[PDB]
Amino acid sequence: SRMCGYCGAPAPYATACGLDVCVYHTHFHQHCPVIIWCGHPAGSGSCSECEPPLGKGTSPLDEVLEQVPYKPPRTVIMHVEQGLTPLDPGRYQTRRGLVSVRRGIRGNEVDLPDGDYASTALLPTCKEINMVAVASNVLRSRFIIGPPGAGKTHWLLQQVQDGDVIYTPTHQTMLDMIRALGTCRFNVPAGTTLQFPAPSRTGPWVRILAGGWCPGKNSFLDEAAYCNHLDVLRLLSKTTLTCLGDFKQLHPVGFDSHCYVFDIMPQTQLKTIWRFGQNICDAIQPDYRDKLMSMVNTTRVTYVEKPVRYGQVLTPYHRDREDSAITIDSSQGATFDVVTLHLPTKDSLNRQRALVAITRARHAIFVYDPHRQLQSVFDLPAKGTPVNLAVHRNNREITVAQALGNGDKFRATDKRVVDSLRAIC
Ligand SMILES: [Ca+2]
Ligand SMILES: [Ca+2]
Ligand SMILES: [Ca+2]
Ligand SMILES: [Zn+2]
Ligand SMILES: [Zn+2]
Ligand SMILES: [Zn+2]
């Protein structure tokens, strides 16, 4: 019950490179010989049965295999007695057809009678490959395209977990990943010219790509555009991947080689946000295609029990404006350090007004929401920050307490020009 490597179908034959093939696909693998029913390679013309010529490849696999050179294995005798041979487990082509030798209790078992058999082993090249699984698993994968000034390390540190595997193409990129992560598990590859640190006992695995499928929970692909195409197909035969790449640019001819699967794979462009924290980005994410990544610190969100006038007051309706308060609609285009979302009247928020209101604040947003109406339009949890805020000249502490001027403990945050000038005293 062996399935074809290209299509699903039953596979009584195999390539020299270890790919199982159905009878149809025996004639569309130009990479290496595939021995057929007549005992010669398909398309060889060795007898009249193998005269029918080879066709062009029917799979992207064939295209990647154009760079994977086939070196013939040595012809060695498989001595057999009572279904036992000293040769290593594997799959061998003999005069009696393709035979498997499997390790067992008594020994390495083989299903053919006693004698000595000239035999050539199948290579491991396409052992793991299954293109129907690739096609399947490519749809359930993400290709995360980075931004111009990449904080993809920052993105990746927030994403990984202890049981994850991060595949990475070269020794240097493995060393880069091990450095970016603090604690991680790995095996230092033999023959390296690099100073690897000692591997920790916990954290995400950091495997070299050529090593292949190490079972784990969520697998990642570091430097996806630089990776070995066949090794990517190896991975996609067993698991789905989160593939991490840099920002696209129209390169010249020859300057872009990358595995074809990424151009099929579901894509997600990252966008850098310098305006407000990740918590705000999370809340507004449903309004935008691109994944919003915050470089700057967390924006404070406080739900106040009574009305307040911290920073620029925003409110849906003109009826509720008091003092220097402004409507949400008229605040479009503007930007402040601190904002007070003032919601004294029921059913006064759609998303579009909330979206504007939430995206005006740089450092803090206080929300008087006695009707609990922001819930029905937005997911914006309470989020403290250990910082001394400054706004017109009062100053709110880390626990939102109107503190004294020069009551020192935490650091102070304030990007407004006139505010920063009056903080010098
Ligand atoms: Ca024929
Ligand atoms: Ca070609
Ligand atoms: Ca209005
Ligand atoms: Zn097939
Ligand atoms: Zn082959
Ligand atoms: Zn033949």
DSSP string of 192-235, one letter each residue: --S-PPPPPSSS-EEEEGGG-----SSEEETTGGGS-HHHHHHH
Q: Taking a C-beta distance cutoff of 8 angstroms, is the pair 373, 346 a contact?
A: yes
Task: Determine how β-strand 361-368 pairs with β-strand 300-303.
Answer: parallel
Centroid of ligand 2 to alpha carbon of 66 (angstroms)? 7
The number of the ligand nearest the C-alpha atom of 65 reads 5
Say whether 281 counts as a known binding-site residue.
no
**Cα distances (angstroms) measured from residue 236 to each of 58, 135, 199, 227, 359:** 19, 8, 27, 13, 40
**Order of strands, sheet of 205-208, starting from the edge strand that comes earlier in the sequence:** 205-208, 165-168, 219-221, 241-245, 142-145, 267-273, 291-294
Phi and psi torsions of 117, nearest 5°: -120, 120
Tell me: is residue 27 an annotated ligand-binding position. Answer: no
Q: d(Cα 366, Cα 65) in Å, to the nearest integer? A: 60
Q: How far is the CA of 76 from the centre of ligand 5 (A)?
A: 20
Is 41 in contact with 74 (CB distance < 8 Å)? Answer: no
Q: DSSP code of 278?
A: H
Identity of the residue numbered 50: C
Residue bearing tokens 């626990």? 399
Cα torsion 248, 249, 253, 256: sign:
negative
| Ligand closest to the CA atom of residue 25 | 4
68's enclosing H/E stretch is none
The answer to the question of whether 154 is labelled as a binding residue is no
Give residue 63 CA to ligand 2 midpoint distance, Å: 5
**Structural contact between residues 342 and 314, judged by C-beta atoms closer than 8 angstroms:** yes
Instruction: Tell me whether residue 251 is annotated as binding.
Output: no
| 222 annotated as ligand-binding | yes
Tokens of 425: 């005293």
Q: What is the DSSP code (8-state) at residue 171? A: H
| 62 Cα to the center of ligand 4, angstroms | 13
Distance CA 13, CA 36 (A): 7
Q: How far does residue 27's CA lie from ligand 1's centre (Å)?
A: 11
**Is residue 257 a known part of a binding site?**
yes
Phi and psi at 98, nearest 5°, equal -75, 125
Q: Which residues surround ligand 4, an ion (CB under 5 A)?
A: 4, 6-7, 9, 22, 25
Task: Give, in order, the Cα–Cα distances in Å from 360 to each of 96, 311, 356, 380.
Answer: 77, 11, 7, 14
Q: Is 259 annotated as a binding residue?
A: no
Query: Closest Cα partner for 144 from 271, 280, 288, 254?
Result: 271
Q: DSSP state, 346?
A: T
Q: CA angle at residue 140 from 128 to 18, to 5 degrees?
A: 10
Q: Is 17 annotated as a binding residue?
A: yes
- Is 32 flagged in the annotation as binding? yes
What is the resolution of the experimental data for this entry, in Å?
Answer: 2.8
1 annotated as a binding-site residue: no
Token code pair at residue 101: 């030798």
Query: What method did the depositors use to determine the structure?
Result: X-ray
Closest ligand, as measured to the CA of 317? 3
